[PDB]
Paper text:
The active ingredient of Bti is a parasporal body that contains three natural sub-micron-sized crystals of four highly efficient mosquito-specific toxins, namely Cyt1Aa, Cry11Aa and co-crystallizing Cry4Aa and Cry4Ba. Following ingestion by mosquito larvae, the crystals promptly dissolve in the alkaline environment of the gut (pH ~11), releasing protoxins that are activated into toxins through proteolytic cleavage of propeptides by gut enzymes. Each activated protein eventually self-assembles into cytolytic oligomers that perforate gut cells, leading to mosquito larvae death. Here, we use serial femtosecond crystallography (SFX) at an X-ray free electron laser (XFEL) to identify the features governing the in vivo crystallization of Cyt1Aa in Bti cells, and to track the structural dynamics driving natural crystal dissolution in the alkaline mosquito larvae gut.
We engineered a C7S mutation to probe the role of the disulfide bridge. By recombinant expression in Bti-4Q7, we obtained sub-micron-sized crystals diffracting to 2.0 Å resolution, which revealed a structure nearly indiscernible from the “DTT” structure. Thus, neither crystal formation nor crystalline order depends on the disulfide-bridge chaining of DS dimers. This step therefore likely occurs after the crystal is fully formed. In contrast, the C7S crystals dissolve in the absence of DTT at the same pH as WT crystals soaked with DTT and remain unperturbed by addition of DTT. Hence, the disulfide bridge contributed by C7 increases the resilience of WT crystals by diminishing their pH sensitivity. The disulfide-bridged dimer is unable to form MBO upon contact with liposomes (~100 nm radius; LUVs) whereas the C7S mutant, able only to solubilize as protoxin monomers, forms MBO regardless of proteolytic activation. The C7S, C190V and Y171F mutants, which form MBO, display the same toxicity as the WT, excluding a possible role for these residues in cytolytic oligomer formation.
Author numbering:
A (entry chain BBB), B (entry chain BBB): 6 to 249
The structure:
Amino acid sequence: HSPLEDIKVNPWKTPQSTARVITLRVEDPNEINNLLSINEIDNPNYILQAIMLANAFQNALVPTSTDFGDALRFSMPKGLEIANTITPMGAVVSYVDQNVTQTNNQVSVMINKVLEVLKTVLGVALSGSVIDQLTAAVTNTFTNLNTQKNEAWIFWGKETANQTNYTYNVLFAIQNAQTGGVMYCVPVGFEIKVSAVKEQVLFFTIQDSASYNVNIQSLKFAQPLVSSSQYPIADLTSAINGTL
Amino acid sequence: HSPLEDIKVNPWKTPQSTARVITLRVEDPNEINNLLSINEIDNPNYILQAIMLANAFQNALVPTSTDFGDALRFSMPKGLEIANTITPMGAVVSYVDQNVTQTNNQVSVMINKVLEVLKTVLGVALSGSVIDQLTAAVTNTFTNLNTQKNEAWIFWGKETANQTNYTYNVLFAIQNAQTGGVMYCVPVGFEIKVSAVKEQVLFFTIQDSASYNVNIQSLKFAQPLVSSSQYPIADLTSAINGTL
Ligand code: NA
Ligand code: NA
């Protein structure tokens, strides 16, 4: 019942997203998949294609060294080998195998360091389109670990009084305006040593301080798009199960 | 190359889950959906059914009072009305509309209070099967809000020097051993007042202290299962878009 004011437009205020977010936890899959699958898609007709890329790079996981512990991590080298075998055929655009370290800094700093590596792998345009999920995904690598601790993508290694070893395996599938005719796939294998006992790590936040020695292995894989709109849903159920 | 030791079995050590987790962020859906869709499924053939339940309860969102701010929240009453219209037909098993409050306690405490309400709605058996996602989902209602702040399920209301108002809309779809022949659907509308400015709230952790006044509105809806294995994927793309 008030008067209608003229428009004051703040060109910096970010508008609320219209993006729909759906998370699926698939109990007891026929075939085990140890990659957290994070998908940024504008056309659901490429969901099947995204899952099938995750199915493939499952074979690029490898055990860590015995001195690290009993863990699986995505290997950049084996990833390259596997990349070649994927059909429809496609190209490895970039790859990285790099150590990241820090001393007595906040976890937030470490997150930014890791983000800097994955942003280099994705590139500016690609980073921008997935910035929210990318940030959240790296955040959830170092914090929010309690609800994740027994999940299929995280593996705990050696556990001393001064240090905890663990691996974390996440995969990004991107298909939007910035990808055009290809879907991009970016698996990431984290091998993390952190200067805290597990009980503390399980409840680490961005405010907590810690020293890290971290190895990141990743690659970027473009696969030309293949719509699946005409295939039955049974084919998607099969891809999720890893039996397709 | 070591000797093979006899088995020492600790019956309390939780085994690593085999559950596959896939998150979809669907850019620019045809129809906007303001519910975070969290799905606990053992058979992907019921994914379509889960999305279609989320599509329906979108219509049960309502604006908050003007004094709260410009926000949408799932309404338990309107939910009941909408429940009746859903096909295939089904039953409202339980519903809640309850205030939860706390004074100068840790955020962790508040999370537990809310969890106690949603566990009452789900029941013991049902709670147990989805305990990890349920805990994470309530955790992400009060913390990890920075990467979420501009997403479609969270709305910011009035923002004073002493208080922040916001709503949070999440939906659980459950289909597993504990559900049998029905899928369960549990939408949740949070109306949250918290005794901190937004800048602080955006970076609240479980360790932070705050006073809350929170209204929770939810219901539990059983729908007999309908497999979609024979339908084309285009039908799933359509359900995601809200055009089916
Ligand atoms: Na961000
Ligand atoms: Na838990």
